[PDB]
Design an enzyme around this catalytic site. Sequence first.
Site, mmCIF file in Angstrom:
data_model
loop_
_atom_site.group_PDB
_atom_site.id
_atom_site.type_symbol
_atom_site.label_atom_id
_atom_site.label_comp_id
_atom_site.label_asym_id
_atom_site.label_seq_id
_atom_site.Cartn_x
_atom_site.Cartn_y
_atom_site.Cartn_z
ATOM 1 N N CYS A 105 33.450 -22.826 15.123
ATOM 2 C CA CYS A 105 34.215 -21.955 15.227
ATOM 3 C C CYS A 105 34.739 -21.509 13.810
ATOM 4 C CB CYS A 105 35.278 -21.878 16.405
ATOM 5 S SG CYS A 105 36.253 -20.679 16.704
ATOM 6 N N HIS A 125 32.041 -19.356 13.658
ATOM 7 C CA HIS A 125 32.314 -17.918 14.424
ATOM 8 C C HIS A 125 31.802 -16.780 13.361
ATOM 9 C CE1 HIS A 125 34.197 -14.822 16.905
ATOM 10 N NE2 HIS A 125 34.058 -15.594 17.834
#
EC number: 3.1.2.-
Lengths: 187, 187
Positions: A105, A125
Amino acid sequence: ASKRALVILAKGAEEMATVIPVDVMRRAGIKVTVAGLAGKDPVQCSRDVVICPDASLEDAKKEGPYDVVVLPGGNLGAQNLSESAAVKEILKEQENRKGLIAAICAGPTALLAHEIGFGSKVTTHPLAKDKMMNGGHYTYSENRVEKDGLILTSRGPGTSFEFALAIVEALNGKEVAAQVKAPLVLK
Amino acid sequence: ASKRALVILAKGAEEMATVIPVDVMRRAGIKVTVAGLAGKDPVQCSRDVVICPDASLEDAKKEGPYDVVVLPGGNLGAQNLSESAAVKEILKEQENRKGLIAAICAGPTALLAHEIGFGSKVTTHPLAKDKMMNGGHYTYSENRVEKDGLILTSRGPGTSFEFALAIVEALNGKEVAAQVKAPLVLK
Ligand code: NA
Ligand code: NA
């Protein structure tokens, strides 16, 4: 001899991208230490889930080295990881000993902060891409999980199972990963 | 006026099938209360993640009713839910007022224990099918998420995002569910 994982848990961590890897790794028989960056006190995650670490990072770091160091997701969690001298030292040591480093992420942005794995292919991400790519020190990938040598990265809560299973495969092999995967009811 | 969710957290809950719904519901702007079955103390989940509830169930139940009552997964967690008179009362009330009841993994077996939603089509974790079907009081489905009126069920950690988004769709609508889904990086 079981493999060991250090998962570094900071305020603002993305709880899904923290708990999924911890749980899946434990299903694989990995000995996981959830270490609180700021101490042993409970940690308030990004969506207000409160998780009690197994140990402080201060204590956990003295029980290394680990077969994998895991940097969970969360934009504010990653910011805290990026600012920590203790995290820097742990990651530098792990890189130097050619041990696996896994980040998901926003987590990979702490690799940038600590100058870890430059020249690697990585993902993050989507919203963290620009931060990760500041200075052009990595090559970016949109694969759900990316592994370039000892640097293993992934994108978001929705890629957390794949990320965790890639850690399991790296440490304990493909057969164990497949065995752990089946009871999860993944698509 | 925001929707409200009660998530009942018992020892032995499957932490992935607990945290994913809590987090996704909060992303959807649902007000979620993580209520500890046994009190406000931290709860040791099935893979040793320790979660601090927002409130005891004793206190949370007095602040009802809720737009959804959520029974997380975990075989031992579900056993604890099934044995609780407080859970029975909460579920009976919710059923009587035609409010949503959502259960995942082994969680639906607590519906059986408390005689909730008989005659509904349901799914569970495959390993919990026989328990759920004892007496033939439900019709079984292998769909990843099943919804029969106010009874919403799902299968496992790997179906938790779909389960959580189905709760969001039921409460806040399809558009909100789609908006919440995109940043998760689901496949
Ligand atoms: Na995944
Ligand atoms: Na899912």
